[PDB]
Structures are given as C-alpha cells and as structure tokens.
C-alpha cells in the first residue's frame, strides 16, 4: 500500500501522528468497540483511506532531514525494531521535520564527537537494564 518497509513506516509515523491527528481520531472513533475483539475493517475503510492519504502527504521530508532519517534507520536496523532504544534519533528526525529552518542552527551548534559516523552494535553495547520491551 505504501511500498515502504516496516521500520521506516514506524519512523515516519512517529512524526505523522501530529499532522493527521484529526484523521487518526476519526479512524479510532470508527473502530471503537465495546469488546477487545476488533471491529470489521469494512466499516472503517473510509477513515483508513483518509489516514493513509494524509500519511502519504506527511512522508515527504526536507533534504536536511536525510542524515537524521538515515541514522534513525541504521539504529532501527541494528536493533530489531526497538523504538525506545532509537527514540533519540527518531526524536531528532521529528525535530528536523517540524520547522526544518531551525535545524540548520541545530546542526551548526554541533560538537566534534556529534560530527562523527554513528555506528550501532547492541551486542557490544547492550545498554542499561534493557528489557527489549
């Protein structure tokens, strides 16, 4: 439907959740049910199509965001889909997407260590009390 892979879809959604909020609310209200069992998608097809169109609109990014998007993709590749471990890079991507004009100064105020290749190896660097959930 998107021709986009799962982790990239998650990264894009972390920002798109704030631009198509009304469509997301409409979809959620349509799918609401009195039991945990899911509702038939045939009823929510229209809201789903609206949400997907807005997501197509939102997926576009400025070129200045490309480095942040790539590092977030690398993080989400090395970690098997753990959003929490890579939220910092996803947060940087969201910040660049929102008001990309200020991201120029954001990058300008960068330290030597930050201006370096970002390689992720979670086996070597597990972290602190990582539950993987």
């Amino acid at each position: 439907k998107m021709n986009t892979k799962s982790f990239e879809v998650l990264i894009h959604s972390q920002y798109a959740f704030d631009v198509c909020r009304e469509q997301v609310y409409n979809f959620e209200d349509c799918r609401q049910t009195d039991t945990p069992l899911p509702k038939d998608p045939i009823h929510c097809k229209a809201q789903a199509k609206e949400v997907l169109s807005c997501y197509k609109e939102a997926e576009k990014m400025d070129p200045i965001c490309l480095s942040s998007f790539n590092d977030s993709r690398e993080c989400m590749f090395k970690s098997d889909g753990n959003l929490y471990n890579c939220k910092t890079w996803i947060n940087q991507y969201v910040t660049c997407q929102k008001n990309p004009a200020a991201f120029a100064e954001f990058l300008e105020a960068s330290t030597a260590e930050q201006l370096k290749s970002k390689k992720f190896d979670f086996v070597k660097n597990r972290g602190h009390s990582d539950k993987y959930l």
């Binding site: 609310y25 959620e28 209200d29 609401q32 049910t33 009195d34």
Partner: protein, 62 residues
C-alpha cells in the same frame, strides 16, 4: 559441651547483635520500598506531563 563465662558472654552478644542486625535490615528494606514508591510517583508525573487528553468513548459503542 559446657561453656565458660567468656564463651557464654560472646554467644549472648552474638545473639543480640544478630537480632539488631535483622531488625535493621527489615527497616532498611521498608525504606527501600518507600524509595521505590517515590521514584514511581516522580516518573508518573514526568510521563503524564504531556499525556493529559482523555477521549470519551463514542456513543455508538454502548
């Protein structure tokens, strides 16, 4: 196994110190649990900082 006065005194002091040590350990565990409660409260405040919106269930659910 008759015991001398010195050995009996040492045994008695060992028992008393063991009792005090156990009581202190239980008290510290109680304090540690209270500390965990405080940390949970702090983190709940932090998380709820921005998650303040509650959406009512639609009327069609019933």
């Amino acid at each position: 196994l008759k015991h001398s006065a010195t050995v009996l005194r040492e045994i008695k002091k060992d028992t008393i110190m063991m009792i005090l040590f156990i009581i202190g350990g239980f008290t510290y565990c109680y304090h540690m649990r209270e500390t965990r409660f405080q940390l949970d409260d702090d983190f709940n405040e932090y998380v709820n900082t921005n998650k303040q919106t509650f959406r009512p269930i639609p009327d069609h659910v019933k």
